[PDB]
Structure formats: structure tokens, C-alpha cells
Amino acid sequence: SKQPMTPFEAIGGEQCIEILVDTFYSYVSKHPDLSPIFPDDLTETARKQKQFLTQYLGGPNLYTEEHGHPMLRARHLPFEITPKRAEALLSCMEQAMDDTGVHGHIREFVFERLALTAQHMVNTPNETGEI
Amino acid sequence: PMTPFEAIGGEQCIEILVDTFYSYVSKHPDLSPIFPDDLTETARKQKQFLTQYLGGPNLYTEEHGHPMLRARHLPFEITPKRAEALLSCMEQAMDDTGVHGHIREFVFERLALTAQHMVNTPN
Numbered sequence: 001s002k003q004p005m006t007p008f009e010a011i012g013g014e015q016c017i018e019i020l021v022d023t024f025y026s027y028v029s030k031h032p033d034l035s036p037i038f039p040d041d042l043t044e045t046a047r048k049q050k051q052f053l054t055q056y057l058g059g060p061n062l063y064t065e066e067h068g069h070p071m072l073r074a075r076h077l078p079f080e081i082t083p084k085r086a087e088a089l090l091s092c093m094e095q096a097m098d099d100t101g102v103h104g105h106i107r108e109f110v111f112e113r114l115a116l117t118a119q120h121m122v123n124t125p126n127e128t129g130e131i
Numbered sequence: 132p133m134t135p136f137e138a139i140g141g142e143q144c145i146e147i148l149v150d151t152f153y154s155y156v157s158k159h160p161d162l163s164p165i166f167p168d169d170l171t172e173t174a175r176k177q178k179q180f181l182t183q184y185l186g187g188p189n190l191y192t193e194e195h196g197h198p199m200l201r202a203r204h205l206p207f208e209i210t211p212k213r214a215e216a217l218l219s220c221m222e223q224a225m226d227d228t229g230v231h232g233h234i235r236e237f238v239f240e241r242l243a244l245t246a247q248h249m250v251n252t253p254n
């Protein structure tokens with residue numbers, strides 16, 4: 001009978017998603033591998049990401065209800081996403097999780113999903129020095 | 132429901148939008164010198180790229196591999212002024228193919244962001 005928590009619930013629901021995503025882009029805007037390629041004001045980027053991660057983790061379909069199918073690989077096609085930038089993005093997410101208290105099984109679950117997805121986003125080989 | 136590609140009109144609307152686009156490019160004195168004299172190949176690949184970017188079939192990457200878009204533009208002298216000129220040509224193409232309203236701003240906001248990422252040379 002008893003419903004398991006959706007991953008969204010397990011992480012702490014809306015209130016946690018808001019904080020983690022805001023802290024996440026705080027690190028993104030201060031990371032030299034990431035600042036240049038994002039929009040200058042990350043407000044609307046963070047709004048879409050809160051909607052996306054909400055439904056990515058099993059909450060309301062907030063993202064697809066507004067923007068349509070995420071098709072993230074297609075949407076990231078024009079941006080220079082190297083492996084180095086994928087690992088930097090993920091590093092910013094790691095530091096935001098520590099800052100917002102995301103730990104244990106739900107942390108390892110949400111992070112591994114995110115690592116895979118960022119691998120799907122890479123669309124540029126690395127610079128010399130990554131053989 | 133539903134992808135920007137099918138919202139904008141699909142394959143048919145991509146065809147005339149990209150054709151009109153490069154007609155404007157070929158006439159723009161800030162852009163024409165850096166493009167090939169014959170734009171047939173360029174337009175064909177841009178149709179591929181826009182179709183996939185907007186959520187249609189994966190036409191571009193199925194033929195050309197990873198997009199690495201900025202890297203492909205690096206051999207060309209792309210200033211902020213030329214980025215605006217390109218955008219001006221996409222704007223008139225959208226006016227000329229009837230691309231309006233919410234899907235226009237969706238597509239135009241994203242091409243403006245991409246054009247800024249292609250810039251590789253000061254004015």
C-alpha cells in the first residue's frame with residue numbers, strides 16, 4: 001500500500017529544489033569554465049532549472065507543462081559543452097548539494113542521474129591535454 | 132507537446148525560412164564576404180541544424196557528428212557587428228516567412244544567444 005517517496009519528495013520537495021538550484025548557479029556564475037557561455041542574468045535559467053529538476057525527480061511536470069519536451073541534448077547543441085565543462089558543471093552541483101544538505105541515498109541518486117545527463121550534453125572534444 | 136520545430140511549421144517552414152535567410156545574408160555587405168559565393172551547402176546544413184536544434188529529427192548530427200558549433204566558426208572573423216547583421220537577416224527572414232508570436236521570440240532569443248557565443252573577434 002504505502003507510497004514510496006518520489007525522489008523530489010526524498011530530496012525535500014520544492015523548498016529544497018529552489019535553494020539547491022539558486023546555490024548551484026551561484027557557483028556556475030563564479031566558475032571561469034562556465035560563466036562566459038551562460039546568459040548574463042541567470043534568473044530565468046534558474047527558473048527553468050527549478051521546473052526541470054522538479055519533474056526530473058518525479059514532481060509535477062512543471063517543465064514540460066510550460067516549455068514542451070526537454071530534449072536536453074538538442075537544446076544544448078549550440079553551446080560549447082566540452083568534457084571539462086561537464087565536469088565543472090557537475091562540480092558546481094556537488095558544492096551546491098553540500099551547501100543545501102543533500103546527502104545519503106537521495107544524493108547519490110540525483111547526482112548519478114545528473115552525471116549521465118551531462119555526459120549526454122557534451123558536444124565538443126576536449127582541449128589538448130585531455131588525450 | 133509540442134516541440135518548437137512542429138510549432139514553427141516543420142520541414143516546410145524551415146525550408147523557406149533558411150532560403151530567405153541566406154538570400155539576405157548573400158546581400159548583406161558585412162556578411163557576404165565571409166560566406167561562400169554559393170550558399171547551397173551552407174543553407175542545406177543550416178536546415179539540418181535548425182531542424183534538430185528545434186526538436187525535429189537529428190538531421191545535423193546524423194551526417195556531421197558532434198556540432199562543436201563555435202569551433203566550426205573559429206576560422207571566420209565573427210565580430211559583434213557581424214553577429215548583429217546575421218541576426219538582422221534572420222529577423223527579416225522570419226518576417227518574410229510569417230514566423231511570429233511566441234515561437235518567434237523563442238527561436239529568436241536562442242539564435243541571439245548562439246550568435247553571441249560564436250563571436251570571436253573584437254569590432
Ligand code: HEM
Nearest residue numbers: 037038045048049052067079081085086089114117118121
Ligand atoms: C554538461 C554541461 C552543461 C553545460 C555547459 C550547460 C550549459 C547550458 C547553457 C549555456 C544553457 C542556456 C541557458 C539559457 O539560455 O537560459 C543551458 C540550459 C539548460 N540546461 Fe544546461 N548545461 C549542461 C548540462 C545540463 C544538465 C546536466 C542539465 C540537467 C538538468 C541541464 C539542463 C538545462 C536546462 C533545463 C536548460 C534550459 C532549457 C530551456 O531554456 O528551456 N543542462 N545549459
Ligand code: HEM
Nearest residue numbers: 165166173176177180203207209213214217242245246249
Ligand atoms: C553570429 C554571426 C554568425 C556568422 C558571422 C556565421 C558565419 C558562418 C560562416 C562564414 C560559416 C561557413 C559557411 C560554410 O563554409 O558553409 C558558417 C557555418 C555554419 N553556421 Fe554560422 N555564423 C553565425 C552564427 C550562427 C548561428 C546563430 C548559428 C545557429 C545555429 C550558426 C550555424 C551554422 C552552421 C550549422 C554552419 C554549418 C557548419 C558546418 O559546416 O557543418 N551560425 N557560419
Ligand SMILES: [C-]#N
Nearest residue numbers: 028045049089
Ligand atoms: C544548464 N544549466
Ligand SMILES: [C-]#N
Nearest residue numbers: 156173177217
Ligand atoms: C551561419 N549561418
